[PDB]
Symmetry: C3
Subunit: 248 residues, 3 copies
């Protein structure tokens, strides 16, 4: 567990991507290597897999001597990170001691000591699955549709055809459909190998999208009764990925 120093410009933007991931997760193992920071976890019900990738190119300074793994209480991490201001510089530093030093540099120098915990790691690999539909979408539309569907039901069907993407949610007598075609502003791209249908639980979806920005481009991949994969990019180089089990 050798010392490292990592610096990110924009503490608030870092906080907000940690808050997205923390919504499903309570404890995470961060793998720190020469090439960047990666984190891979499952939510307690083992229905969602989260995969974060922060390559070293998004850090203004990145000094890692040898690769190591640190365990972190995501709630306590998140409460500290929330104190960051939008033009603060964030510094994550470890010494010989077994705690993370989190510093905000801006109008003043604020440093928190975060204690490192032991997180037993599951055998987790991001499998490359045969998705038959891919959709790129304005976060606003996606956040919209999940909220709308929650008025009606607990589950949300995704339907991809060659020229339209539909989310549909039916209650006992109420019903909502959101429909997108490439003529529409919210939809940036749509590729379908064959017409695809699946359904996912809104509670999980709501938690996945709660931190996503209204203007960010979100990529969905799914298949008939397959997991749903959702991803967006951080500073164009980082990636956050969710893999969500279908409702069967």
């Amino acid at each position: 567990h050798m010392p490292f120093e990592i610096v990110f410009d924009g503490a608030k933007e870092f906080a907000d991507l940690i808050a997205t991931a923390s919504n499903l997760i309570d404890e995470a193992a961060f793998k720190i290597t020469e090439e960047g920071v990666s984190m891979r976890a499952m939510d307690p019900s083992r229905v969602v897999l989260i995969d974060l990738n922060l390559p070293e190119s998004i850090f203004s300074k990145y000094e890692v001597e040898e690769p190591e793994t640190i365990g972190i209480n995501m709630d306590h991490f998140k409460k500290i990170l929330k104190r960051g201001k939008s033009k603060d510089t964030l510094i994550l530093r470890k010494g010989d001691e077994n705690f993370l030093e989190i510093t905000f540099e801006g109008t003043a120098k604020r440093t928190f000591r975060l204690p490192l915990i032991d997180v037993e790691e599951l055998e987790l690999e991001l499998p490359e699955l045969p998705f038959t539909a891919k959709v790129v979408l304005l976060g606003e539309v996606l956040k919209e549709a999940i909220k709308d569907a929650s008025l009606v039901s607990d589950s949300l069907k995704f339907i991809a055809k060659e020229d339209e993407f539909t989310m549909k949610a039916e209650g006992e007598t109420n019903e909502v459909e959101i429909k997108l075609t490439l003529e529409d502003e919210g939809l940036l791209d749509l590729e379908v190998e064959e017409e695809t249908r699946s359904a996912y639980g809104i509670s999980y979806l709501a938690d996945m999208v709660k931190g996503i920005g209204k203007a960010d481009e979100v990529t969905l991949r799914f298949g008939t009764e397959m997991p749903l994969q959702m991803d967006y990019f951080i500073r164009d180089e980082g990636k956050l990925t969710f893999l969500l089990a279908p409702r069967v």
Copy 2:
């Protein structure tokens, strides 16, 4: 019995319906060729509400033949609150017993709202002998009602020829909102004799919760008579409250 009605500015339509559902829970809407109208009482039969939306405020108005539909206002309000300010609102009825509500913007979102049947009654808006008229900025009205609620549960309106006064007394504390024609908040005053009435703040607070701070409100009342309160939607729509006086 099909119709199709289009409104530019979905969130504005929501705010208008939200004003009405503050007191109402179920309503019959009469859809005629000349526009949409609605008339209902709150559950305690103290307040009557009248909503008139003429054809001219809709960007497209297609009505095959007059019809009445009954709506759960709360369900209507929950759906209508998901429209965005730049969305186009479409109210369409096919041949079945659902209202089809559509928001057109960055996406097409379509809800199906089931219709209900509503006990409609001998509900007419009579022209009572009002002796005072007041036009004032919604801001002044909304603040005078919040001011008075910290002091009492009733608000006394007092019109004389040169001053409009709203006054509220508790056991200890007092508040008086005074308006003369020299004040920015009073746009018009016409008083044919000294008029004095009192109304309950709980009802008043619900009537004005949804009124905008720069909307222009018209008040008509008479001594121990109902208070009539009007403001205009897009200059041609009209919402009217008629409120029973308190003893």
Copy 3:
């Protein structure tokens, strides 16, 4: 008659009274022709607060009959929260036992707040041998107190000739805020001797709750001494807290 006092900016006056009410329940206001003065302690006798409003911040200041009034700070503060940022505020004492609070803007709004009888202590604002003075913006002071609250119940203030640091330590966690005159948050540092003290965060939280992020705050303290913080209102008025140290 006995006095008329006018302040332009009713919301700004409200915020000032709101900062003091965070720790006080009642207070005696002394209205002389030099200005209005107020000196109170919190219920636990740990914080002394001193407010001084010179007549030069009031747009009209007529005190016929010097007096001292007694005010329920929470009643006062819920009345003053009704003022708008563009209202003029008028405080009028007539012959009777009430304070007349008027907001003049869009309309004329008048409240009658009943005066009360406050058991006034004799409170000195003593001169103290402070070894350290710090001037910093509200934003950094307000953030250090919030950061320290995630860790502990008290924070240590530590001043050296070059550095001001606030440090809070829990069972396991730790927060350290450090300022040097290189940093935009610290506008002045004067340190006679290396000075160390600690204070309760709950009191500091309530002290800064009302301070604005742009406000400039002065801290004086000495080793194991009270902490004095003050900020200025319209350059001439002054609000001072004195906070007992922690053991």
